[PDB]
Design a protein around this ligand. Structure first.
Ligand code: 8YJ
Lengths: 4, 205, 223, 4
C-alpha cells in the first residue's frame, strides 16, 4: 500500500 | 427489548468527512485512493438508508462546526447518527488546516449536548494513522492507538463488502468483527479497533 | 439469533482456559489509596462465575507491581495449545492507562503486552479477554484481544462497600443467566445496559462501561 | 458507594  | 428501536421515518444522518489534500503548513501528502473509498462508503451507507452528505477538505473549524451544527439539529425522527472520518492522524487527534481532538468532535453529541439523540446509537468510523452522558457511542478506528492503496483502504473495502451483503441481517458488532477478520487476513499488519458503549444490539432493520 | 460456522472461535479444545483474577484490596500508605471495601465480594462472585464457565481460575491478592507483571509474563510463557482462550480480571484502583499495585502503578499496556501474538505463540488466534474494574447524567500482534473496562477513559467507576463493583455484580448476574448461550458482545452489551440503568459533590451520579474489541470471530462459551 |  502507501501510508498515512 | 434487547435491540435499539429502529421504528423511525429516517434511519438517520450520516456525515462523511473526506480529507485528501492538506495545506503545505501541515506537511501531509495527498492521500491517493481516498476518492474510491468515499464513493463506496457513500453507496453502502446510502443502501443502509442513511441521509449521507460528503464534505471534502475540511478544516479543524469546519469539522467542529459541521458536527456542532449536526448535534444542534432535530433527530427525533431518526433512528441513529453516523459520522465517517477519513484523514491523517495521531494519538487521540485527527488532522486541512491542522489538528482537532476526537473528544471535541464527539462531545457535541453527548446526552445533554443533544437531548434529541439520547438513547440512540451514535456511530463514528475513523480511518487514519438519570442516564449516562457517554453511553450509546460506538467508534470503529482503522488501527489501534493504517495502510491505504492509491483500490482504496483495506478497512473501508472490507467494511463495504460486508455492509453490501449483510448490512440488513447482521448486528453491528458481528459486522465489525467480520471486518476485523478480513482486514487481518488480507493484511499482506494492522487490526482495526471497535470501542462500544452501546446498550443494545444494533440491526439496520 | 443463529450460530453461523466459520465465524465462531474454535472451542474444540481440552480445556476452556486459564482465568487469573488479581484482587487488590489493600494498598501501601504512600500511595494515598484506600481499602477497596467490597472487592472481596467481587472476587468471590467472579471466581464462582468463571469456574462455572469452565475456567481454571487462580485468585491472587494484594499484589505488588513486580508481582503483577511477573505473574502475567509467566502465565504467558505456559503452554496454551490445549486451551480455547485466556482471561484475566484486574480489580484495583486505577488512572488513565495505568492500574495500581500495592506499591504503586503500572501501565496496563505493559501487562497485556506479554500476550501479543509474537510473544505468546500458544495463544495466537485465540481470544485474550481482559476485564478491568478500576477508576453526570440526564497474523497481527494485536488481534484477538478484548477489553471490558468498568468505565470510560477519565470518569470514576463506582463500587458498593458491601455489594461490590456494579460492573462486577452485573456481569456475574448476566453470566449466570446467559454465559453458555450468548456471544460475548451481547453479554457485554447487556452489562452496559445493566450498569446504565440499575445504578454532595458525589451524589446522584452514573457510569458507563467501555468495550474495546479486536476479536476476529464471535466468541461463545460452549460446543 | 466508593469509586476507584
Ligand atoms: O489497552 C491498551 C493496550 S494496546 C493493545 C491493543 C491491542 C492489542 C495489544 C495491545 C498491547 O500493546 O498489548 C492501551 C493502553 C494504553 C494506551 Cl495509550 C493504548 C492502549
Amino acid at each position: 500500500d502507501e501510508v498515512x | 427489548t434487547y435491540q435499539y428501536n429502529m421504528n423511525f421515518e429516517k434511519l438517520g444522518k450520516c456525515i462523511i468527512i473526506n480529507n485528501k489534500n492538506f495545506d503545505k503548513v501541515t506537511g501531509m501528502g495527498v492521500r491517493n485512493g481516498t476518492d474510491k473509498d468515499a464513493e463506496a462508503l457513500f453507496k453502502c451507507f446510502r443502501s443502509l438508508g442513511f441521509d449521507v452528505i460528503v464534505y471534502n477538505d475540511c478544516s479543524c473549524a469546519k469539522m467542529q462546526d459541521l458536527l456542532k451544527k449536526a448535534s444542534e439539529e432535530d433527530h427525533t425522527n431518526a433512528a441513529c447518527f453516523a459520522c465517517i472520518l477519513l484523514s491523517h492522524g495521531e494519538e487521540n487527534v485527527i488532522y486541512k488546516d491542522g489538528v482537532t481532538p476526537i473528544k471535541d468532535l464527539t462531545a457535541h453529541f453527548r446526552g445533554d449536548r443533544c437531548k434529541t439523540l439520547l438513547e440512540k446509537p451514535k456511530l463514528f468510523f475513523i480511518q487514519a494513522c438519570k442516564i449516562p452522558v457517554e453511553a450509546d457511542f460506538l467508534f470503529a478506528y482503522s488501527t489501534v492507538p493504517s495502510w491505504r492503496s492509491p483500490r482504496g483502504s483495506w478497512f473501508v473495502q472490507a467494511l463495504c463488502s460486508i455492509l453490501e451483503e449483510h448490512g440488513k441481517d447482521l448486528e453491528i458488532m458481528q459486522i465489525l468483527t467480520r471486518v476485523n477478520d478480513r482486514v487481518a487476513r488480507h493484511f499482506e499488519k494492522q487490526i482495526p479497533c471497535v470501542v462500544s458503549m452501546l446498550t443494545k444490539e444494533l440491526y439496520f432493520s
